[PDB]
Amino acid sequence: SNIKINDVFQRIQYAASAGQTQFTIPFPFFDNEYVLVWQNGVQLVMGGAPGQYGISGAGSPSGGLITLVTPAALNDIITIQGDMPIDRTSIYSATISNLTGSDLNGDFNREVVMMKQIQTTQALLQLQYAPWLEVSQDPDVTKDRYLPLLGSGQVWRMNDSGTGIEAYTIDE
Amino acid sequence: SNIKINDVFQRIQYAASAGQTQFTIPFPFFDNEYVLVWQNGVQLVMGGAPGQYGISGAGSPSGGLITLVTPAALNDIITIQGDMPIDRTSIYSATISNLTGSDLNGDFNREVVMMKQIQTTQALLQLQYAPWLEVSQDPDVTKDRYLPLLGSGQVWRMNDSGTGIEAYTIDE
Amino acid sequence: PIRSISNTFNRGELDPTLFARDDLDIYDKGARKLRNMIALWTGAARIAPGTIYIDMMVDRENGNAVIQDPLMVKGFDFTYDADAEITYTIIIRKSGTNIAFDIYYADTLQTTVTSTAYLATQIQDIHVAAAHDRVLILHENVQIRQLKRGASHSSWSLTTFNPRVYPTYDFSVIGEAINYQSFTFTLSATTGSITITSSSAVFTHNHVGGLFRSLGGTARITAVASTTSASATVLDNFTGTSCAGNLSSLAEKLWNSDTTTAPVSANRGWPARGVFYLNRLILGRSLAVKNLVNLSTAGVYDNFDDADLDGLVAFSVTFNGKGEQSVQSIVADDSILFTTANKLFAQSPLVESPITINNVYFAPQSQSPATSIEAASIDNQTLFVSSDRTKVMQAMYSTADGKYITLPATMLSNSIVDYINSNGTWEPAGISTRLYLATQDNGTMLLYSTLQTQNVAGWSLRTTTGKFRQVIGEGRQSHVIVEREINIGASFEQTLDYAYLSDPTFKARYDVTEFFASSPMTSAIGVLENQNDYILIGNQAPFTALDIDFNLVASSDCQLQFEYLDGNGFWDVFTPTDNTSGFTVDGTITWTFDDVLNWAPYQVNAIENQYWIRIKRLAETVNTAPVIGQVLINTGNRIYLERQSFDEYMDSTQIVTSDSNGLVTGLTHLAGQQVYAITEDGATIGSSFVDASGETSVKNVNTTLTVGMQYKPELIPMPLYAPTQMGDSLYAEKYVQDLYVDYVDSLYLQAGFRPQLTDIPNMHLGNYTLGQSVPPQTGIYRICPRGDWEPRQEFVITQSQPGPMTIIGVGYNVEVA
Amino acid sequence: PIRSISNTFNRGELDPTLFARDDLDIYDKGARKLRNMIALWTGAARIAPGTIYIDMMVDRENGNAVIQDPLMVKGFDFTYDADAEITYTIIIRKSGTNIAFDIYYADTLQTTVTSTAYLATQIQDIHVAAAHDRVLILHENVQIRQLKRGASHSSWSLTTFNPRVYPTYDFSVIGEAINYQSFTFTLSATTGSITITSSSAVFTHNHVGGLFRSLGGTARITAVASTTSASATVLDNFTGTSCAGNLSSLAEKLWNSDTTTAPVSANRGWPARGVFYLNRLILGRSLAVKNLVNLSTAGVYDNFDDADLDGLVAFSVTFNGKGEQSVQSIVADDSILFTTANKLFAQSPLVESPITINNVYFAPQSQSPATSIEAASIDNQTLFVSSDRTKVMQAMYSTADGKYITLPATMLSNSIVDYINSNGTWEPAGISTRLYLATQDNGTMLLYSTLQTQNVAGWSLRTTTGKFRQVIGEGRQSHVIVEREINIGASFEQTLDYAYLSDPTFKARYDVTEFFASSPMTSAIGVLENQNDYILIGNQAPFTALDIDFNLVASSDCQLQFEYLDGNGFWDVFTPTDNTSGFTVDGTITWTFDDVLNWAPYQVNAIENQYWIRIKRLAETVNTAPVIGQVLINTGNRIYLERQSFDEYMDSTQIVTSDSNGLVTGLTHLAGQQVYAITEDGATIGSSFVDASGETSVKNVNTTLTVGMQYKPELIPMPLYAPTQMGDSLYAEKYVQDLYVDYVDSLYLQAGFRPQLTDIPNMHLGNYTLGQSVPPQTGIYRICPRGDWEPRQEFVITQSQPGPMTIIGVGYNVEVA
């Protein structure tokens, strides 16, 4: 817990070489269960059987390593993403008389990694308006921001009045 | 209070039974004003008048309660969401002072809850690409992620060059 | 009118019937409650000493059969070398149908000495008389034994104590022998070896070694041929050979257990009390004559020859008053004190008595019945438990009165006194206290701090996660024998301490503890009669399984919901493995400690410090509600030997070491309990549950720790006393604006008006280096309690987790309306 | 409103747990701290007496081998002629594997007497019994010796004490010899020289000189031919030649160390305690019977013949209560007082006891365990250390109670009491005090000023630049045995008292004293991990060299910066000779006293009175930080004998003369220490360092001076107590507008609220002639301390440099809010 948290995206993707088995995790992670691995869009299981992977480097500031049991084919897509839960199950006593550096660093670092996972999703996997566009600066104005549920064969379309986004059916 | 923050989504939704008045809040909250309640898409107000509700359980790990003044009709949709403003909830002296674990617990627990509310909206109410998709890993490449503002009758359509999303008028 | 008042705790806990006694100088020197704390003679209140686990009492000669009956264990201390600090803790325990002596030194079992001369059912009636270098084992029906240490800690021998010459007694004087006042005794000669003949049957075999006195002569009987003929050796010459029965004196041996050798004798028994006083051995309270003591020959402890009637010879003292005066305790204080069933016998210490026959002046000093618990000597006074065991009596000589004066030492603290069953003394090193300790039948222990010349006398009550059964000690050290529960896994032995039925609002309380505890055929009770009804269950120790037998199963699934009560007073749902399938079939309900992670002792409707679980019926429609016959839990009783220590702040502690994962093993005596861990620097790092296998996980890894159970200190000061000019404000409306807590060398304090207390910080932000343990703190902390306006409102000083604690006073700023 | 209050100090230093006890009349008569001062019986506080260096304890028979183990030295006083003021200070010290007696008089070693009868490891167990004209040397395993002075100071003899007739004891009574109750003894005749024959093996060679009693006769055994035959001389005629074993008494010699002469005897040992009382010699606590004392024949101190049982003959007293009663000390106060392992034994002074056999009435007075430190008699009371050595007990007869009452004399000052290891008394001439002194394991000394009838009882704590190991004295004079450190030049022996690691802000404290003190393979610690980190080191005495062993050297130069802390609290840079070249290689770091000219004791984070140095890493980049295995300093331990005097205001003083350059030589016992110089007129002219060769420079040239070390007095009064009408103001906010310091015959005073104090002037401008020494001053000085508003704020009265100091009171003008 007495480690630094570097500014690194909590998601990495690789195009495997022929027979490659080792893939680097460039971001810190505190537990093996808090890392998700995909190969060609199929989530893998941690283990020793063929079609599974082993993982090391938990707690290291520089990340760890993913080792596939079965060597990957050429141009296989390997995706690694951190997925730590957002909670707090270890708390201090009411009147502590010993506060360790690891405990204090642990609480601050843990929340930084949580925020980095949220920001990695919104920076790489989500849509947004360009920061300079003239979106309404009052959040209560939901004209450009609130979406309706789509029915079958429907798309999002700003209505004729330009007052909100509505579901619109296309049968072409 | 020195409670533990469990990993629970900061939003819950129910379909009411006939004449139901009590609905459980499964996530922790610290102030009554920071819990929003909707009934069929209309936000309710705390109080004792008909059409209002009462709330209990602030500061508790879980198991809060919402009590409607007017009993709900069958299949009324009740939505309960946590909405706490992001802010410092503590202040520490620069000169030599006292510290307790209660102070630290209050700061870290409230920041964890604030992060969970952001991630609850991200996970349940927002759109994202599947994590394994081959999106550009450099955020400066905005082809797939930056949206334009929509005019009347327009949809989001990737242009024919495949270089960006532009507003497109549907001839209808 | 705003008044400043203060309160110290020199008088300990005061009985509630004293709360209108503002005329006494004790109103600002006492406490409403003083629990798991002691009163120092400076007036401060210190947390009570903790205990260290030593061993579990087992029948070592029968495959370590666990002993679960407290009447089968009785310990005592024996100091062998005071300067080398060698004191042995000897435990008399059941060994089959007989007894054995377990000898402990340096918290280690040294050796075991068995004995078939005693029954396991006689253990509680065995008393000792510790000499300078040996211990005598005394029982009214068993000949005196001697336990003597050899050349090492593990070398001990138990032999029979054989007097050189037995004491003699004429039992016909008390009507316990044949009356010979009308007989005639004929002697063959007046000197040398003679034959004594009686005109009627008088002699028994116990007369061998007895004495015959008449006509100025004395003869020692050496053989008894029949009931009318005996052989004797003349010690002092007779003046004639014809002795009238009414002018003679025939005495048999005072101690004997032989009732079969012809002619048959009575079972006179053996002494049951004793003490070594100066150069004599005093033994008394035999089976046949309970009101008589015998002093040995001066300088010869094992000789009780009483043929002569002058000089340094052995002699007897008989205690008589109005009624029974059976000797309870022989006290080596001043000129010897005898506590009896009725009256205290002693002689004035001002009188110069050399303790010889015909120069002894024991007289009935005062009426004070005493029990068989041995009297304690400490702080210039003698303390002994009364005969009904509901009082501790203090005896001191008063020159102004010319006699010993007895008065209740528990005079001001009668409310906390149950029935007392043992006592001891302790004078701990480095602590400003002189302690008298006494365990009770209810399982608590009384603590009495006394400094009599300084008017220091404070009682307090000590409780543990278990039951105190005995306290041992003569001042140098203190041990306790404690009955505790452990988790026994898949087996079930004990019953729940508390059980209630409750309504949907959880306000009704219907006590059903007896029905759950009783066997199914003795009592049963219907439960969960309506939807949303409750079953509330509590126990002193944590449990992880229930075993339920139904006299009538539920007709359908009750849809049970399980919750447990945590340390914040919050009920949390957990999911057990329910093998009764909603009370539809007999079976068990089990859960793991991870399901009840936050479980902690708490209070529910004036019942304090229990582990609570509630079961709620959610089923809308069940036609036949279940009827429960008996409920058992997976805990069993054990009996431990523990040593008290002022360096410990937990109970039943043990030093352990955690591995790289924080795992700790070897805590089997604490299986199923909640324990705290304290580092060597003196920081408490948290609590955890020991599982049934004796393993638990702690926060600090690769660390040496002390692990034990919390006993929570509580200090409730006396009611506010702020006399104004209008008069005593004993019943006026009062409000406390400021509460000052004045503490020395303390950690983890919290104080105020319940339920919302204020924690007292012990960490200086800006002057603290991470990783270090802040030492115990001294200072004054000011708190706004936010209490009510009642004349008799309670403020509490307590501790959130185990640690040092000393409260030297409590101050107030009171608005007296 | 403003209240005027005052405070005197006749109760000494008070325990912090008493600070809420405003009801007691001691709140304005005590002090929070009373260090290096004593409480006069008038209520004033005077600076503690200084000491004069006498000699260094060495093994004079082995080339003056320096003694560095305090257990190898034990001294005692012996008054030979009170009117001529001739008292000898005798030091028992190691001499090879044996002991020697160093006899001092007039601060000079007179002679040495060696002895091979004792081992060097038995020194601490040797006790003495001083008579009017000789001293008996007592040890439980060595026969008594006599140390008697010849015709001059230097003429002494150490001979063996041989009783005319040995005392006898029957060891079978305590089960320490063969039990003969079933045997039969046959006499050849009833008169004259006879032979005693036993039916079974009983006799040992130790029975020679013993007694055989039976049938009204007594015989003294003169030879033991075998285990069944012996020769005896009839002292009182027997009535027959056949004696039953159970009716007889056989006693061997009580004292014996011969276990080889056939038939082999047991090692009975010799007495270890004794006193001369009136016309008898009392010897007790032998090896075999620790709870027995023997009184010699009246008027014949060396005769212990106990054949007779009446008159002025020698006799024994045996002490028994409940448990071990081994005799600790025999006190000649009133009648004889016996402190034992458990109970105090004495007889009432009101009775008329002529101290003869069968006219002795010793009884157990009270439960008060004592240790082997000899009891002290002073101020109409008896003081003795308790068995656990954490309390001093006071014994005093109470006619109202009819017995001796024991209570803790340290009841109000328990906080400063460590484990006590010796004591003495002192009644200094011209000083209003009666002193009881006691040194402790931690190296401090307790001082107890008592005047019991006037309710004077004040404790204080004495500290030195070193560690007190023993205090010697019976009232006429007082000596101490002190362990001090000296600079040993190029060699290294001692470890640093304190060591810390710190961060660039110099606020963090990471204690690493144990790692520095341990050998490199025991423990090591990495230091100077980051740029601008610190190593803080402190020691009780000055040091001029470090010797460092690295488990891992630094990969590159750390660019060390060195600083020392001066008396103003200012860190000043100095440049040593660094042979480690920035912690890159094992080596030494040395500096001269000129580099550290302003070095003085100071406080760093609650650690007071140390010489501090800090080392700062300036190097920007080092790849591998050093790891230190052990650090040693160039100081070594020595043991000194010093005499306490109220005319001295410094420790370990010596009278010297400076030359024309101010150079002073011959201060080898103070090598490496900081010393002050005081002129004959009583003016302290300044301080300087003594180098390793015992030389120093003073300001005054061609002057006779006294040179010694400063011990700093400190007086902190009790918390402000100004009760108003609103109630006790024990916790109210208070501010001190005016502080009055009331003093008599004082110099160099300073007082106030830390850190900024105020100096009290002692020179009258306009009435002072240059070159004269202003005499000690009397008056009242008024100060505005500029303190805070806290209820428990501390005001200090101390001294800037050594000199006379007497504070008779402290006054305040307090604004009570």
Residue of C nearest to A98 (CA): C773
Q: Please state whether C334 falls in left (phi above 0), alpha (psi between -120 and 50) or beta.
A: left
Name the residue among D687, D691, D732 with its Cα closest to residue D710.
D687
Q: What single-letter DSSP state applies at residue D753?
A: S
Asked whether the beta carbons of residue C809 and residue D509 sit closer than 8 angstroms, the reply is no
Interface check C755 vs B, CB under 8 A = no
How much of chain B is helix, strand and coil, in % rounded to 5?
Answer: 15, 25, 55
Interatomic CA distance for residues C349 and C399, integer angstroms? 9
Cβ–Cβ under 8 Å, residues A109 and A1:
yes
Facing residue for A94 by CB, picked from B102, B126, B149: B102
Contact indicator for C120, C72 with CB cutoff of 8 Å = yes
Asked if C733 has any chain A CB less than 8 Å from its own CB, the reply is no
Task: Measure CB to CB from residue C774 to each of A93, A97, A101 and give the nearest one.
Answer: A97
How far is Cα C162 from Cα B118, in angstroms, rounded to an integer?
A: 90
CB neighbours of residue C624 within 10 Å:
11
Answer yes or no: do C766 and B63 touch at CB < 8 A: no
CA atoms in the 13 A half-sphere facing the CB of D151: 0
Q: Does the CB of C229 have a partner CB in chain B at under 8 Å?
A: no
SS (H, E, C) C278-341: CCEEEEECCCCCCCEEEECECCECCCCCCCCCCCCCCEEEECCECECCCEEEEECCCCCEEEEC
- In contact, D497 and D464? CB cutoff 8 Å: no
Interchain CB distance below 8 Å, A157 and B153: yes
Residue B153 has its nearest CB partner, among A96, A127, A158, at A158
Q: Does C760 touch chain A (CB under 8 A)?
A: yes
Q: Which helix (H) or strand (E) holds A121?
A: helix A101-124
Q: Rounded distance, CA D419 to CA D407, Å?
A: 18
| Resolution of the experimental structure, in angstroms | 1.9
Contact C747 A94 (CB under 8 A): no
* Best residue in D174, D289, D320, D788 for a mutation probing chain C (most C CBs within 10 Å): D320
Q: What's the CA gap between C339 and C325, in Å, rounded? A: 9
Q: For C466, how many CA atoms within 13 A lie in the half-sphere containing its CB?
A: 30
Per the CB < 8 A criterion, the answer to whether C461 and C13 are in contact is: yes
Question: Which residues in C lie closer than 8 A to residue B2 (C-beta atoms)?
Answer: 568
Cβ atoms of D452 and D397 closer than 8 Å = no
Whether residue C159 contacts residue C102, with contact meaning beta carbons closer than 8 Å, is answered with no
| Residue indicated by tokens 């009841």 | D411
The rounded distance, in Å, linking the Cα atoms of D303 and D317 is 16
Say whether D807 sits in a helix, a strand or coil: strand
Q: Do A94 and C759 touch (CB under 8 A)?
A: yes
Nearest chain D CA: its distance from C785 CA (Å): 16
Pick from C484, C489, C437, C435: nearest CA to C464: C484
The answer to whether C708 touches C50, Cβ cutoff 8 Å, is yes
Which residues of C fall within a CB distance of 8 Å from A96? 763
What gap in Å lies between CA B10 and CA B119, rounded to an integer?
9
* Phi-psi group of A162: left, alpha or beta (phi > 0 → left; psi -120 to 50 → alpha; rest → beta): left
Q: What is the DSSP letter of A149?
A: P
Q: How many CB pairs under 8 A join A and B?
A: 144
Residue that is written with structure tokens 């490496």 in the block: D672
Say which residue the tokens 């319940």 belong to.
Answer: C754
Q: Buried (b) or exposed (e) across D196-208, using 16+ Cβ within 10 A?
A: bbbeeebbbbbbb
Note whether D566 and D600 are within 8 A (CB): yes
Decide: D233 and D210 in contact? Cβ < 8 Å.
no
Which amino acid makes up residue B107? D
**Partner residue opposite B98 with nearest CB, options C568, C573, C765:** C765
Alpha-carbon distance C545 to C541, whole Å?
12
User: Contact D291/D325 with Cβ under 8 angstroms?
Assistant: yes
CB D209 within 8 A of CB D193: no
Closest CA to D636 of D507, D536, D776, D541: D541
Nearest CA in chain D to C82: D341
Task: Determine, for residues A93 and C762 on separate chains, whether the beta-carbon distance falls below 8 Å.
Answer: no
Q: Give me the count of residues in chain A.
A: 172
C-alpha–C-alpha distance, residues C441 and C457, integer Å:
23
Chain A and chain D touch, per 3+ beta carbon pairs within 8 A: no
Provide the Cα torsion D370, D371, D374, D378; round to 10°: -40
Q: Is the dihedral of CA D510, D516, D522, D525 positive or negative?
A: positive
Experimental method: cryo-EM
* Count of alpha carbons within 13 angstroms of residue C151, beta-carbon side: 0
- Cα atoms found within 13 Å of the Cα of residue D122, Cβ hemisphere only: 18
The dihedral over CA atoms of D79, D80, D83, D84, expressed in degrees to the nearest 10, equals -110
> Which residues of chain A make contact with B126, given a CB cutoff of 8 A?
126
Q: Cβ(D49)–Cβ(D496) under 8 Å?
A: no
Instruction: List the subunits that have 3+ CB pairs under 8 angstroms with D.
Output: C
Torsion of CA C192, C193, C197, C198, to 10 degrees: 70
**Residue to test with chain C: of B100, B105, B107, B109, most C Cβ within 10 A:** B100
Distance CA D687, CA D698 (A): 8
CB-closest option in A41, A121, A133 to B149: A133
Write down the residue that tokens 């020991």 correspond to: C690
* Distance (Å) from the alpha carbon of A49 to chain B's nearest alpha carbon: 22
Cβ distance B97 to C572 less than 8 Å, yes or no, reads no
Collect all residues from B whose CB is shorter than 8 A from any CB in C.
1-4, 60-63, 92-100, 102
Cis peptide, bond prior to residue C775, ω within 30 of zero: no
Q: Do C742 and D729 touch (CB under 8 A)?
A: no
Q: CA A118, CA A127: separation in Å to the nearest integer?
A: 14
Chain C from 623 to 662: CB within 8 A of any A CB: none
**Terminal CA-to-CA distance of chain A, rounded, Å?**
57
Q: Which residue of C has its CA nearest to D406?
A: C380
Interface test with chain C among B96, B98, B102, B109, by most C beta carbons within 10 Å: B98
D16:C808 CB<8 A: yes
Question: What is the distance between the alpha carbons of residues A164 and A168, in angstroms, rounded to a whole number?
Answer: 12
Measure in Å the smallest separation between the Cα of C702 and chain B Cα atoms: 24
One-letter-per-residue 3-state SS of C513-524: HHHHHCCCCCCC
**DSSP 3-state assignment of A60?**
coil
Least CB–CB distance from B96: residue in C571, C598, C766: C766
Residues of A at the C interface, defined by Cβ within 8 angstroms:
93-101, 104
CA distance C705 to C659: 11
